[PDB]
C-alpha cells in the first residue's frame, strides 16, 4: 500500500495473508468470508505469464495478523487449504477479467477479537454504494512504493467514474472491474501495490453499519502514479459464482 497508514489492532479482522510454504514468503492478500472460506484474486494462484500455478499443498493462509514478518503467537492462526477454485472464465491472457478465486480451509478457523468474517454485498448494497466519489478501504502488506511495511497498511480511496477509469489506460476495462484512487487535481494520494493483490476493498454500509467487501485488489499500471488508478474485481458481479461454489463444495 502506497501512502497509507498503519492499521489499528483488529481494524481488518477479515484480512488474510497467503503464504508460500517453501521458500517461506508472502504471496498475496485475501479475505475471510466464513469460518471455512477465503476469497482472493485468481492471479494470486494462477498467472502463466509469470510461471505461477500454485496447488493447495504449496500454500498456507495466515489469519488474524498485524505484523508482516513476525509469527504472532497466540493471535494469528495458520490454516491449510483443502481446495482452490478459480473462476472458470478468469482471463489471465488479456486483462485479468473475472479475477476471483476461493480457497476452502481444511478445518474451520475459530473467530476471535482478531479474526472475523467480512460480509459480501447484496444487489441493493452494491447499487447504493458503488458510486463515483464514494470511498472504500484497501488493506495489505505489499510494497510501500513502486520499501516494505512492518505492519498491515490501510488506505481509503474514492471510486472513480467509469469513463475516467477507461480513459486512464489502454487496457480494456470490463463490467467485472471498477477503479479507485484520487485524481491528480485532488491532491491526496494512495494505491495498492505489489503484494497487496487479492486483498479486500471494503465499504462500511451507512444503512446497517456492517463492512462489505466490494472489491478485490486486481491490477494497476505501476503504483500511485498520477493519472492512473487501481483496478478491483467487482465482487457483486461475480457473486452468483461465489454462491454456486460454496453451495456445492461446502
Amino acid at each position: 500500500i502506497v501512502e497509507g497508514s498503519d492499521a489499528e489492532i483488529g481494524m481488518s479482522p477479515w484480512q488474510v495473508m497467503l503464504f508460500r510454504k517453501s521458500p517461506q514468503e508472502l504471496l498475496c492478500g485475501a479475505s475471510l468470508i466464513s469460518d471455512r472460506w477465503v476469497l482472493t484474486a485468481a492471479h494470486c494462484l494462477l498467472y502463466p505469464p509469470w510461471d505461477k500455478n500454485f496447488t493447495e499443498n504449496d500454500l498456507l493462509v495466515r489469519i488474524g495478523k498485524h505484523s508482516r514478518t513476525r509469527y504472532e503467537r497466540n493471535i494469528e492462526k495458520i490454516s491449510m487449504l483443502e481446495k482452490i477454485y478459480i473462476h472458470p472464465r478468469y482471463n489471465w491472457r488479456e486483462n485479468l477479467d473475472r479475477d476471483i478465486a476461493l480457497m476452502k480451509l481444511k478445518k474451520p478457523v475459530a473467530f476471535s477479537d482478531y479474526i472475523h468474517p467480512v460480509c459480501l454485498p447484496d444487489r441493493e448494497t452494491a447499487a447504493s454504494l458503488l458510486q463515483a466519489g464514494y470511498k472504500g478501504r484497501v488493506t495489505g502488506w505489499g510494497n510501500l512504493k513502486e520499501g516494505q511495511p512492518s505492519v498491515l497498511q490501510v488506505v481509503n480511496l474514492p471510486i472513480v467514474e467509469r469513463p475516467v477509469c477507461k480513459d486512464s489506460t489502454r487496457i480494456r476495462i470490463t463490467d467485472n472491474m471498477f477503479c479507485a484512487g484520487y485524481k491528480p487535481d485532488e491532491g491526496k494520494r494512495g494505491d495498492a501495490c505489489e503484494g497487496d493483490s487479492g486483498g479486500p476493498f471494503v465499504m462500511k454500509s451507512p444503512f446497517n453499519n456492517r463492512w462489505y467487501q466490494m472489491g478485490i485488489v486486481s491490477w494497476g499500471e505501476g503504483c500511485d502514479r498520477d493519472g492512473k488508478y487501481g483496478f478491483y474485481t467487482h465482487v457483486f458481479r461475480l457473486k452468483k459464482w461465489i454462491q454456486k461454489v460454496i453451495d456445492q463444495f461446502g
Partner: peptide
C-alpha cells in the same frame, strides 16, 4: 454469517476507528 462485518474491537464495542468517518462523509 449472521454477524459478518461487525468487528469485535469496533462495532461490537461501539468504538469507531480513526478514519471510518472519512468513508461515511463520502456517502452523499
Amino acid at each position: 454469517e449472521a454477524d459478518c462485518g461487525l468487528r469485535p474491537l469496533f462495532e461490537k464495542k461501539s468504538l469507531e476507528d480513526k478514519t471510518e468517518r472519512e468513508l461515511l462523509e463520502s456517502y452523499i
